[PDB]
Symmetry: C4
Subunit: 377 residues, 4 copies
């Protein structure tokens, strides 16, 4: 004797809980590739998915995409086009204060729908990174004069007295300026910098494609676990967090947001693009140099926390960011959420479900058992 | 002092339960390679093993083998020979409705023991895939006129309003037509499509050899876990499920069925065969193109959920399907079951036992510690 | 304030149990490489270690080494020299009954301390494999006439009516003949064949270096778990068990015995030796063919459960078996046991301790972080 | 409604415990790469970090670095420069007693801040290894006459009657001489040698880069677990322990100390340096031979417990040890500890937190997803 098909939806009530795991059940020491999001119910087109995201307490973007402050990723060209496509760029500071201020000016003075713009002047939004030593106070002053919208305090370990004092000084001196503090990977770190007055947090330590901090400092955290534990705390204070490092595809972006991130920062993915700094070279493939700011070369302009490498040409971000945007829309559709806001609410309520992945399951999830294969878009 | 050998069978009663794990104990997020079935008692020849399998509520096959609806796997030639060998083929729809209807006609009009045939006309059984948009209503009408026996609603995420409405429309318009809905990987998805009136379910998301949905959508499920959790629900309603994706050998077929699948769908395994579409080419090995329907090439005839690749020549299925058939018989024999029906009953009663496999155990289970090696059959 | 060194031994009493895990605590689905034995106390030289081992109820060897019944491992030459070095050889049956009987005769008629010899005639001990069909009754009769000491019922799944009847027939017809039944990997299998009257058991399914039974039959068990669970049962009846398959080094032998095996069977390790059948060939390395009896080539003299491969030349066993013997002595010394009998007693009492090994720990345990490396003995 | 940022630090009290795991919670069978230390609070410069370390009960070094007693690592040249840089060298004994005594004399007679020197004569500290057989009594006498400061009883399994008697003999004969016993990996081993009168312990079995003891003896322990369980016992008696083997980078040193080690011993890392014995050779890379003392070559001057290999040129330790020193300072800074003494106290109190690392997390922690990459310092 079999059950009547008409009672199929009702019979779900006989189960203790929904299939798969809630986020809390899921979250030891795992990262993005160690799990999946289970599909939900589709009753809308992907084009309907809204990807509006909080960068800081006062700044909201139309897309959760942020380009990393690295000298092989983000200068004026990257910051301009990232802003035009609904994200934002963080200009690096491996350069003179004069040079950095000039790059900010190029972004703010640029003229030509989802574009990231200031509410008042309708100029493109621009971010910039700085250190937390005394000399950077002057550097920031020059950046602010150039029209800086948001500053990122750049550090591998942001929970320091130096950064705390810098944050306090900025809020007091430049109250209209949004401050993103970091990097952090623990609840205690986040509380410290939130208490200091941070407008946003940057999450990650060692997860970068070119980073080896975990190998030389023995210090860091798996990215997935870091994002979850930090945001679970920080979101209670309305402090948006950037998931920074270890993002290589659309799936990582979805998972980063699922675990509590408001935006995601990318370095390696955008490194090979036309708009990134540095020239192309052949090896017979078209490559661009991509290096950690803690590498000997970058610091040269000593203990290295990063390495110098190369990545394949990815083409222009004018096609690559839309690919990520459309992809994330389709990802949200499969999960059954119409916005990142809804996605956040559904996850915390336990409606969105997750599943672990054994090493075998991970291999199964990718390409396998082929003689050869070639195309993301 | 040692125990008397005569009391050996009786002494088993002193143990709390049988050696190894029941299926429920076994079932986180694992797939086929993560476990094994423990051997049982052999008191019959392998030739006695019956492999009769339910494809849908009303359709039963002599073998649990289904060829996937892909343009590099199943057209008329594949569907004909699959049917002749006791399975069935699902004709792809990456073509005009006219072209697809012609391929169905070729199968139904073909003339020449275990063969899959309609009960009334004794014509070869034929399956076909369609989308769930309005234009497909017309396409299905043409397929039905050509003598279609079963339709597969083709989607990576089948739990949508569009597919639900399509299922309702088909049952109402073509009541004699069997409908397989999918793809699904969760209990909630299955309930939705069963409630809609599905005659069978297609299980899998991201597990395909050419699929990368898990990588770009962050959405899917390990195949083993998906089959178990879906069928544990669906079998209560007498809805047979196809285990689709990640099958590479006879062992995967056995495990798929063990975990609750009624039939298994194969794409990559049948791709390199003579009866599959596409021509052979040399690279110095004989290869055939095998590509996901979500690949840029297939869609071309945009976010790719599949990749284009190649597989080695496997020869004719006239020898390959019998190899799978005989192999599965021997597999059932080792386990100690005389049919797939008995296999299903024994597993759910806890008589058939399972065992996890550590990564070391998996390497041990395959070929290892040789300088070189060569032959499945 | 620190503790007095004089109280160091006494302070161990404050701990709930000894460091590491007992065997029961250790024993899911793991195999040899997944764990280690913890060192004990050395108060004796390695030369004092006795490696006497039970092959069957009535046969004891001076070394726990058995050569596998494969046509690329054991014929007369191997069986003779294995016996001379304190082990035993099992002659394969991929040949006519006449040919097999001749090989046994060569062993028993051979004339020239730890040597394995019959108690009465002082002839070298000899084993031989047979099938369990009717034709093998005649074959066994010819082997017995040639002076066979022990017969191995050769099968990948030994728990069958055919093997059970064969065992009953042999005990009744040739009461003086020792019977080793198998292969088995579960408690239920062992009870069945012990109840039938087996004098020893052969443990393993899929763990062989050339075996792929787990891949095609989905049936088998990780070797470590199989040895433990079978012997934990079988040893209660005084039935010695051979750990067959997956042995590649001295460490595997120690672990096999630790988990309850009385002897270990080797195929791949002895395949490349001078005394094995088959000629050497160059590829620029000296190799010998090594193949599973379930391979197409071996069966040829169809579903393959084994593959044909090659192994590097290992030299003569006149140097290789002493290497294993001395190595196992040193292994026992490190653990702090003076015999395999003591080793068995110490393990079951919980005195010998074990430790799991993460994948990282396994890599650490081998050679790592070198530019290159070369020598077992 | 969001929480007030001012209450961020106070809100931490609502959590049951600190983020991450205490060391006890962390500690199955894992090693260094299986975990990380979570970052703390920085309120000091790295230059302030003190790395003073106990080698034995009476000997303290300014740096926790010890060069291993291997004939491809430490002779007079290495021992001199290790001492000059605040560590110590252990001269190997794969040589005549006369030759070893001469090497010690070269170190003690050498003349030319953090340098490791005797308190009385201000001569460079020098260590030396010996065996535990009768002939070594004479050898030690010659070493002591040459001015030996500390002796290491060299063995893969130090818990033996021979070593116990040697320790007793040395304390009685040369009371002023510091004795390091080992190697050990269990609590029971440590208690035995502490009770015998050891002044320090050497931890490790099989973890060496050139060691294969675990593979051939089946005996050993994952290094991380060994260090923790041994030191948790030994530190109660004020017996410093050397973490010996498996150290490849600064991160391993930090973790070794975190788990309870007082100093770390390095062989492979220092093998390729200018000051190590053996000449350079090209293969087109500059290499030096590095081999285990249990290798056939080393023993030659038989069952091998080590292998012969090669490592890349690392340059002079005059630059490499400062790199490790500065790196470890920065590591301590990130964790938020001002000394190794504080680091030890903070870990045992549960203030320093840890995190597991899945295989995915480990890959993420290193370099990944690059076309190519190059520089530690
Ligand atoms: C450690 N972390 C470093 C370094 N340079 C940059 N970064 C960090 O990694 C992120 C990039 O990660 P991807 O996976 O490439 O996207 C950056 O945003 C930054 O957080 C370094 O040298 N050492
Ligand atoms: C995701 N899944 C895809 C795609 N093309 C086909 N398929 C799915 O995979 C199965 C084939 O799996 P194999 O392991 O090759 O046998 C198909 O039956 C279908 O379910 C794709 O582009 N993206
Ligand atoms: C499955 N098992 C097979 C086959 N030929 C031999 N054997 C089994 O494996 C053992 C050898 O294992 P090694 O790891 O090489 O020492 C044999 O003793 C036997 O039990 C086969 O074709 N399929
Ligand atoms: C086992 N252990 C051996 C052998 N030679 C040296 N050693 C051990 O390994 C340590 C070196 O480890 P690395 O990872 O290279 O730094 C030595 O200090 C010693 O404890 C051997 O032949 N077999």
């Amino acid at each position: 004797t079999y059950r009547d098909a008409a009672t199929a939806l009702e019979h779900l009530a006989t189960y203790a809980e929904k299939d798969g795991l809630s986020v809390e059940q899921l979250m030891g020491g795992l990262t993005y590739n160690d799990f999946l999001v289970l599909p939900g119910k589709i009753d809308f087109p992907s084009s309907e998915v809204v990807l509006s995201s909080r960068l800081t307490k006062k700044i909201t973007l139309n897309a959760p995409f942020v380009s990393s402050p690295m000298d092989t990723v983000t200068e004026a060209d990257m910051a301009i086009h990232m802003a035009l496509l609904g994200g934002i760029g963080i200009i690096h500071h491996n350069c003179t204060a004069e040079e950095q201020a000039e790059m900010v000016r190029r972004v703010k003075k640029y003229e030509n729908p989802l574009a990231s713009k200031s509410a008042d002047t309708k100029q493109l939004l621009c971010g910039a990174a700085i250190g937390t030593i005394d000399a950077d106070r002057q550097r920031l002053a020059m950046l602010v004069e150039a029209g800086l919208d948001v500053v990122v305090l750049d550090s591998s370990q942001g929970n320091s007295v130096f950064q705390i004092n810098m944050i306090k000084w900025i809020k007091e001196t430049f109250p209209d300026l949004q401050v993103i503090a970091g990097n952090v990977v623990t609840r205690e770190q986040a509380a410290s910098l939130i208490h200091a007055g941070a407008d946003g947090l940057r999450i990650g330590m060692g997860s970068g494609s070119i980073c080896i901090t975990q190998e030389v400092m023995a210090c860091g955290r798996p990215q997935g676990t870091a994002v979850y534990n930090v945001t679970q705390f920080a979101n209670q204070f309305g402090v948006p967090c950037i998931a920074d490092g270890g993002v290589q595809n659309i799936g990582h972006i979805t998972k980063a947001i699922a675990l509590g991130a408001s935006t995601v920062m990318m370095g390696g993915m955008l490194a090979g693009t036309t708009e990134s700094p540095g020239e192309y070279f052949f090896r017979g493939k078209r490559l661009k140099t991509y290096r950690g700011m803690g590498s000997i070369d970058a610091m040269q302009k000593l203990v290295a926390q990063g390495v110098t490498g190369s990545v394949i040409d990815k083409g222009s971000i004018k096609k690559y960011i839309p690919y990520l945007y459309n992809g994330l829309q389709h990802s949200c559709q499969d999960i059954g959420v119409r916005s990142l806001v809804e996605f956040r609410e559904k996850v915390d309520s336990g409606s969105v479900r997750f599943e672990f992945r054994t090493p075998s399951a991970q291999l199964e999830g990718g390409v396998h058992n082929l003689h050869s294969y070639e195309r993301l878009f």
